[PDB]
Amino acid sequence: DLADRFAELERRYDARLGVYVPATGTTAAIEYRADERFAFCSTFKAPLVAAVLHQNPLTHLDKLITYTSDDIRSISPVAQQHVQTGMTIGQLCDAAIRYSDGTAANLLLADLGGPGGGTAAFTGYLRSLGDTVSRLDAEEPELNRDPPGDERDTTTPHAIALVLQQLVLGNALPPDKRALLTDWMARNTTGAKRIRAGFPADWKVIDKTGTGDYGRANDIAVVWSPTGVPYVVAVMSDRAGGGYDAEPREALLAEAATCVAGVLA
Amino acid sequence: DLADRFAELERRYDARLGVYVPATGTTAAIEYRADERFAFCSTFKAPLVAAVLHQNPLTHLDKLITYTSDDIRSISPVAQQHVQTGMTIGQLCDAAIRYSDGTAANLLLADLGGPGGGTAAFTGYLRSLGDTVSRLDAEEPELNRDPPGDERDTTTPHAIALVLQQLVLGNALPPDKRALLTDWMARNTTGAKRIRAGFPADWKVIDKTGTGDYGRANDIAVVWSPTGVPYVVAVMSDRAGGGYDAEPREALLAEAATCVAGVLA
Amino acid sequence: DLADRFAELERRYDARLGVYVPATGTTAAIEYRADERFAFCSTFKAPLVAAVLHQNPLTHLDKLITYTSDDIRSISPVAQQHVQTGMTIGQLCDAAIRYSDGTAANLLLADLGGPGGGTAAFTGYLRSLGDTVSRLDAEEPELNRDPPGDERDTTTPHAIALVLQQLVLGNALPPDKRALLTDWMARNTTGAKRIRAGFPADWKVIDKTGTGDYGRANDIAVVWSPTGVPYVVAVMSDRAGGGYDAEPREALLAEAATCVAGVLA
Amino acid sequence: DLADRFAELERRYDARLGVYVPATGTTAAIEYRADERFAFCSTFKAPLVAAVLHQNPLTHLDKLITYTSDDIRSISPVAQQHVQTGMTIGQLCDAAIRYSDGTAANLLLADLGGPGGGTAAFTGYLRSLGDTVSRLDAEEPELNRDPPGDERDTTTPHAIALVLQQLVLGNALPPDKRALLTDWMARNTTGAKRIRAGFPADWKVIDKTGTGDYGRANDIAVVWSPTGVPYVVAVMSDRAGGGYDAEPREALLAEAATCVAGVLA
């Protein structure tokens, strides 16, 4: 019956909304277009960091990577600053999550190795976690601007929420590695107007945002009740019928998050 | 069906919940035990101030009232500080709303004059905005400790919400007087953990709290959506079965307010 | 020569300014009216918690203290909410520092025990730290309203700065207790517009504020440079010539703090 | 005096500092190597935009420019994305200021037309604002790597401050053109760690950064005191002697800006 409010929000914002909240021990699952495909955009950077963490020892984070000015091919607020000094795999992880750095994601994909510069390796890592649906085919920034209807560089709310649940709440990572991913998402800077804005302030929120053309605006998050119960909230949206240049509407994601918060209360 | 969530909240906190949100042009009215009597507690201090404002000129706020240490009969954080200097009606209004000062309320009641120390005048003022249900019979602090089932010093979420709607949104006061009430409720200090804690931070919240024995915890509020749509939210609660010494559960009001926010989004 | 910029601020704000920054290993001390007496106001609440910490085991923080409505004699944003339940010595500490709770401070003083409700015990604890100047003679809220010139309830910037240096940077407390005082001062809610507003955001700031009649506005703080060098900044002000009702000017303290920051850079 | 602190920061960071703050009605001018030549680096992109604005109508911002992958010759986070669609002068203005886009800068230079790809037309526009000293001779990225001592592609903190003063505070642009420049500088993404990091957060800061070889790091900024008084702060630094590969030290610029803030308080 909450699916009437979501469809009302889709009408209001001229957009398509996708919502998934995995069912917990006490409460039931929340689904709206939960098995419809939305574009990853930058949300893939969260399990990308987890893939590098799972495949390498903790001391692989101190390895220095250097890059040229020709590698800065997308918005890279941190990689742009360190073209002469270079950056370690740890700082690349910090940048790729907290500042959604495009270049940091592409080098992290390269560190994964393999065909397509690491896209195949990344999709393989998602498969190991049980995600049968998601797929990454391009690197930054081409992945953001796939045409609508094309299945490349897409996930689903259902699929991405279950990946995030294992990475933060489950056992996909050892505790010392799981605490680094969690801390990076807790100190994220790009999502203050989305799921964070939809939930009361005494609910803790860690998230990774995603934005691209065709009005694409995503936010995947883990949230904690004031009493400590954790939930996973996957919210994805696009406005593909409005064309390539359609503006994303962050208010839709905040409003949807407020609907969810009332149900989880 | 939001009525299931409220009765769930009643079972979880061992309490009786009363919720009223007046219907606006866009949304429908929210009701849960909306026409069941709850105790005013300190929520009456909001229409009390508006009563003094309505019956008097603005310069009546500069009238100085002196009192003795025998008049301090309830929680009076501000009145206790000025026993030798005295307080103006204006300060007595500020104290009674922002700090829920008990003695300032009793003096303001005396400023309404008449039988029962100005209770009869106050209920009469309540009949003028159209509220034939509510009634104030005692002064501070006795009004907080009436037995359950007794109809003295009681209002209802339905009754109190419509009063507040006229006083803040309607025309029960002139604009100059209407702004002083709202500024005192905006900078209130006693309700951070109730309705304010249940709504997202980009919603604006003005409120007057009430607390008393039998686990009585109330919060009456005017809220504003991030786009500026105002609503009235009346949340009242008691735990009479737990007896006279039952602890009030503020988390219940915060939780109920999050449910309301989800529907209003 | 920085004493010219301070006296210019004194002229601009119609106020008397006291500033002390203890000399560190590299840099020299900063003094302005550094051995002149200013009123403690609520800055005493910081070493008061330290005095309770020093005099008791860590499990004494779990002791439940109960109080009545007649103990609320000043602004007590937290103690006013827990009259029915009571508060633990830990919560009383947290409230007295973070919200500058007046009643919580008076109960902590009483926990020290002794003449004057524990004021003598407090003044003795300062003497043990090497403070020969300060004195606390009254309780809240009488200590904020002593006449000017009166030595009662007065410290000096020099004296209070060296007390705070021992309590946070020195060895006047064991590490497990010292981290509790530091964490309460780091999460203070009352001093965003004073020394915090005067220092750049990449400087860490812990503080305790003081405010009272005669335009009295103090802020005692420990700050950390972006590279980790700690400094102690004692800033006090009053406007006694402006009368009992003179308004404190927080802009003076933030401005004075910006002058100090330039010298410490 | 303040010039001893600057030379101390010089010793500590192994650099040569250049600081100019144009004197206002109230305060005196700040100078330190103010008429010594530093390399423009990317700070020229600030008056470059104003040049296009000044000699063109508002409709010229919608002119579309197309370019090849052979024109991408330096760090161009925005120009790399639009090689097949092309960018308009307006977007090229936005990119060249907010992301210090190199290829956007070179296209805007060519939009000024003339010898040296519009370097002569740019220096010419600088002479119209009274700047006899500054000169731009190369295009991106050759201008960032001129040897020390060489006078090509150099300004001075004195010479770069007054142009910016005219271009943001003065009448070098009509108001409708002046606000586009200001809004792009206000939303800059490349200078959080420099002058912005040295001033308290309740000061407003707009800036354009510059970075190049030989440890060159600049920041030209307009700041606003919390009460509204605007100033111009030109901070330039390099580390010749340390070599072509010397790393720029941003902490120097932030430290120098904190010294300026103390004087201006």
Ligand SMILES: *C(=O)/C=C/N[C@@H](C(=O)O)C(C)(C)S(=O)O
């Ligand atoms: C993750 O893939 C997204 C980046 N989105 C934004 C960004 O901050 O870079 C855009 C919209 C600017 S982008 O598609 O590069």
Ligand SMILES: *C(=O)/C=C/N[C@@H](C(=O)O)C(C)(C)S(=O)O
């Ligand atoms: C200590 O500095 C505290 C001030 N708190 C209040 C109090 O009850 O004392 C005030 C603000 C009313 S005061 O300045 O006395």
